[PDB]
């Protein structure tokens, strides 16, 4: 047989066209690392071999070297474009040692056993926003006031980014509502004077309460500076606690300085929903102390305990209990106390 042009497609594989017809002879060195692989990939390339296509010379080159050479299945490792072949190599004395392994002649491949878990990513369900879900579902006034926290925080955070927007839309925030029945604030917050963004948060609070919004109907829309009629609250229902209503009365105050920074609310709201209100805690029983944070973090444990029906109460608590500092954490307690300085 005449051998064709010596061009190489494969490590030891070089496809040449014999004088038309063609044949390639990829060699297995008997002492290599992948020598078992090449002595077996042969079978894969000899999967398509015809019924009489492996008359291997079988003196010391093994009879079995081309006995299970014929195929069993069609998995397509590299190609299936093969018809004939022959065991052509060092014919005589090709090894000072070969154990002639001869072990388990009829096992096949387990589809390469490629089943490793391709890295997963989750999605953020965003079909809804505020004014949509608000009319859709009315949550607990604490489940609602907690949503308020997610607002002011980014509101705190965004002005903590120095950035500012004059009048956020009613639906300027979008609601993940990723788990059914619970809304959520956008982490990205793409949609867009000090306390301006905070004022928008106060205004949309009325929408959450379902109470009529004065900044809308009554007027003074789109201006944090504008103020008239003593910032009336038309919040008649008592579903909202009087103590937090005092905080709302404190909101929209004569001066933005007497108004709270969004962290103060965060403070307040961290202090209010979490922590706990007791007669022992009464009378500003909390004063300057650092460890109390952990003690307070313990008082925030019971969020998992009482009214943790809506599971989301545990979700964001981690990113909230960790980040706290008494410097901007004691004043609101003082202003909370006023809820009880009610007297």
């Amino acid at each position: 047989y005449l051998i064709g042009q010596s061009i190489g497609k494969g490590c030891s594989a070089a496809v040449y066209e014999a004088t038309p017809l063609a044949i390639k002879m990829m060699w297995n060195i008997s002492a290599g690392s992948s020598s078992e692989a090449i002595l077996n990939t042969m079978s894969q390339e000899l999967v398509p071999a015809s019924r009489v296509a492996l008359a291997g010379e079988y003196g010391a080159v093994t009879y079995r070297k081309s006995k299970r050479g014929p195929k069993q299945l069609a998995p397509h490792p590299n190609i299936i474009r093969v018809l004939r072949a022959f065991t052509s190599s060092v014919p005589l004395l090709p090894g000072a040692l070969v154990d002639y392994p001869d072990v388990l002649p009829s096992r096949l491949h387990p589809e390469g056993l490629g089943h490793g878990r391709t890295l997963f990513l989750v999605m953020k369900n965003y079909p809804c926003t505020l004014r949509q879900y608000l009319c859709v579902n009315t949550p607990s006034p604490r489940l609602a006031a907690m949503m308020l926290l997610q607002l002011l925080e980014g509101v705190d955070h965004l002005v903590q980014q120095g950035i500012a927007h004059r009048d956020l839309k009613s639906d300027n925030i979008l609601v993940e509502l990723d788990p059914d029945g619970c809304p959520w604030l956008v982490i990205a917050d793409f949609g867009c004077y000090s306390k301006a963004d905070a004022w928008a948060v106060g205004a949309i609070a009325y929408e959450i309460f379902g109470l009529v919004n004065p900044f809308y109907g009554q007027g003074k829309a789109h201006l944090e500076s504008r103020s008239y009629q003593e910032a009336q609250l038309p919040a008649l229902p008592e579903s909202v606690p009087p103590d937090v209503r005092q905080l709302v009365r404190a909101l929209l105050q004569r001066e933005a300085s007497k108004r709270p920074s969004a962290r103060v609310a965060a403070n307040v709201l961290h202090l209010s929903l979490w922590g706990e209100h007791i007669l022992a805690l009464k009378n500003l029983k909390l004063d300057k102390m650092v460890g109390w944070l952990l003690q307070q973090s313990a008082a925030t444990l019971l969020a998992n305990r009482l009214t943790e029906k809506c599971c989301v109460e545990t979700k964001m608590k981690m990113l909230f209990l960790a980040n706290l500092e008494c410097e901007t954490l004691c004043q609101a307690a003082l202003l909370l106390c006023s809820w009880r300085a009610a007297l």
Partner: protein, 409 residues
């Protein structure tokens, strides 16, 4: 070593002086005393070398062994047991280095001094290979040569025993051929039977009715049982049919014309069970390129298509139309404008009760044939059979649900 202990005091029938077969069993299961050879068995065995060596395969789970035949060559040691092996008995074996499954054998796979021996639990051991189309089991008394496999169209030299099924039957030792059995009135399964027949391998034949002359009925022989048919045929020698790699396009045309004329004769004689494989062979004839002058490629293919036609004709005559679908589907793959071919395929579809694809192809054939009434009446019958299946379900499904309400108390 258990094998060594059993080997002692064992009368051995040995092929050579020191190599052979060793009666060694521990206990003997009750089984047919007469020696029997069986291809179909589910033997249970434990392949353990023992004796300072270890066989890790087949020792674990007992493996049913596919016996190729009485002289099966898959494992040499396995048949050695079947020598003087009963059915439903127990057997044990011994090492024979020559008898290794991988030819001569290699030392790591098979120990140089010891092969694989097994405490065989012998099971039913009677009979030889069966027939995939039924009607016959291998009933031989000699071995084939692998050199001379008779081929379709090779006129043969067979002798006949002289008694079918227990009845002295009337025939002679005539130069049979696949397309000849129906003419001279003997069991016609001979066609696919002589396949397993070579030169110098005697093989009596059990005959079932649907395979040979059984179902066909005998006015000359005088046979009571049409299913119980047994007789011996002695294929002394035979010629070789000239095959694809053997014929040539001119002789292709020659034998093509001759068989086409024969096909008209087959139609006139009405016999067709012969015609199935001869039409199939013409099909295969043409199914490959000729690389020659084919000005009448159309004429060749026309012979082929008329063969398709009569093939579907016979499939209508007796068959369950699956091979009708085959032949006329090849027709459609070549000439789908057959004035009758696709018509009979759609008629099969309606007799297959698939009257919807029948609607399709029947309106097609009406496009090409707006002349005759057969196909239009046939599609009308398709509508009738549709309505019949309708009323069928109608009856079988009248408030089928209300019946459930009966159960409710």
């Amino acid at each position: 070593s258990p094998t060594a202990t059993v080997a002692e005091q064992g009368e051995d029938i040995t092929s050579k002086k020191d190599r052979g077969v060793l009666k060694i069993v521990k206990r003997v299961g009750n089984g047919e005393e007469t020696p029997m050879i069986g291809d179909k068995v589910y033997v249970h065995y434990k392949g353990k070398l023992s004796n300072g060596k270890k066989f890790d395969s087949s020792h674990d789970r007992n493996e049913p062994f596919v016996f190729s035949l009485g002289k099966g060559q898959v494992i040499k040691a396995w048949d050695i047991g079947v020598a003087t092996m009963k059915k439903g008995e127990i057997c044990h074996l011994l090492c024979k280095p020559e008898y290794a499954y991988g030819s001569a054998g290699s030392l790591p796979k098979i120990p140089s001094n010891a092969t694989l021996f097994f405490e065989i639990e012998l099971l039913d051991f009677k009979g030889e290979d069966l027939f995939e189309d039924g009607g016959i089991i291998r009933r031989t008394k000699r071995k084939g040569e692998g050199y001379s496999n008779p081929n379709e169209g090779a006129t043969v030299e067979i002798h006949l025993e002289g008694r079918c099924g227990g009845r002295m039957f009337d025939c002679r030792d005539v130069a049979f051929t696949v397309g000849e059995g129906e003419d001279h009135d003997i069991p016609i399964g001979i066609d696919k039977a002589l396949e397993k027949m070579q030169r110098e391998e005697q093989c009596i034949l059990y005959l079932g009715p649907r395979y040979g002359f059984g179902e066909a009925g005998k006015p000359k022989f005088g046979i009571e049982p049409n299913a119980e048919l047994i007789y011996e045929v002695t294929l002394k020698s035979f010629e070789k049919a000239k095959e694809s790699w053997e014929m040539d396009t001119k002789e292709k045309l020659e034998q093509a014309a001759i068989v086409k004329e024969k096909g008209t004769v087959y139609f006139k004689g009405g016999k067709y069970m012969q015609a199935v494989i001869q039409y199939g062979k013409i099909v295969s004839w043409l199914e490959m390129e000729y690389g020659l002058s084919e000005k009448e490629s159309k004429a060749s293919e026309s012979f082929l298509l008329a063969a398709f036609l009569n093939l579907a004709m016979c499939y209508l005559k007796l068959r369950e139309y699956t091979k009708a679908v085959e032949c006329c589907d090849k027709a459609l793959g070549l000439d789908s404008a057959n004035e009758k071919g696709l018509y009979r395929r759609g008629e099969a579809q309606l007799l297959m009760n698939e009257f919807e694809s029948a609607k399709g192809d029947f309106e097609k054939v009406l496009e090409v044939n707006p002349q005759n009434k057969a196909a239009r009446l046939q599609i009308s019958m398709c509508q009738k059979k549709a309505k019949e299946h309708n009323e069928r379900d109608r009856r079988i499904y009248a408030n089928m649900f209300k019946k459930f309400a009966e159960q409710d108390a």
